[model samples]
Target: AMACWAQSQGYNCCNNPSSTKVEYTDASGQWGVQNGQWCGIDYSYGQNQGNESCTGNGSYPCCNTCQATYTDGDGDWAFENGNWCGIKNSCKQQPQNNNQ
Candidate 1:
């Protein structure tokens, strides 16, 4: 999408790579957005969703769809509702590293 092109053009597209700098939808089947956060993928531009850090870390899973598993260093975790479309999870760990 244009987001990639923008990034290549030094436009800091898609929320600066990691922290999707756009809206997001929670994994609890809810709808909301919490910027200044990062996800496995930056789903900005409304293509799908911005972030996926709604609720909390264990509160919900950052998994994608269809039997998805967004695992960390713990174990094979699972996100609720599996609505990983909208980036709505704010379970940021320690540092918020966003690739320029």
Candidate 2:
């Protein structure tokens, strides 16, 4: 749905855009404070708990409930769960691309 729209708008749905920024919101419904490498929507969590790379393949715990907001290739803004969002983007073929 969203991907199809992005492609129609002349955006590359398969490649990482030049700008990849995401904001994460915690379970408390509060915006997560920036922690340098572990604060943004793509890098939150700490060590083993919030490790973005440790997704799916194994059972892992979410450090916090967060929301991710970013561009979805078609120049349209997309939103998804952050660290604790149970749903994972199966369509994403690359790492760092999945919001869950």
Candidate 3:
């Protein structure tokens, strides 16, 4: 938990939001194109955590832990023992703004 997955493989996490332009994805997490080369993603770059209970999106189980590996149109995903699981909504909820 102290080191990022890619660091173990001699890579550093992308340094900027633009650096996160994903070019590939695997067990080490998303790989991005930065400086014309590959950079690993530090999935927990801007994540939050919570203890509230929740369910998955009909396939994988809701993640009980917080470190995330990727996000798609669906939601946040976490890698666990070579598998992927969705993070609980409570851990990802943003304050609802009323514009009415």
Which of the numbered candidates is closest to the native, going by highest TM-score?
Answer: 3
Per-residue lDDT for 1-100 in model 1, tens only?
2334334434433443333333444442212233532232333322323343332233344443333245433223444563432223323222334325
TM value for model 1:
0.22
Per-residue lDDT, model 1, residue 42, is 35
Which segments of model 3 are wrong by more than 4 Å?
1-3, 17-19, 45-100
Q: Report the Cα lDDT for candidate 1.
A: 0.34
Candidate 1 local lDDT, residue 27? 42
What lDDT would candidate 2 get against the real structure?
0.28
Candidate 3 colliding pairs: none
Misplaced by over 4 Å in model 1 are 1-5, 14-68, 71-78, 81-88, 97-100
By descending TM-score, how would the candidates be arranged? Answer: 3, 1, 2
Lowest summed lDDT across 10 adjacent residues in model 3 is found at: 46-55
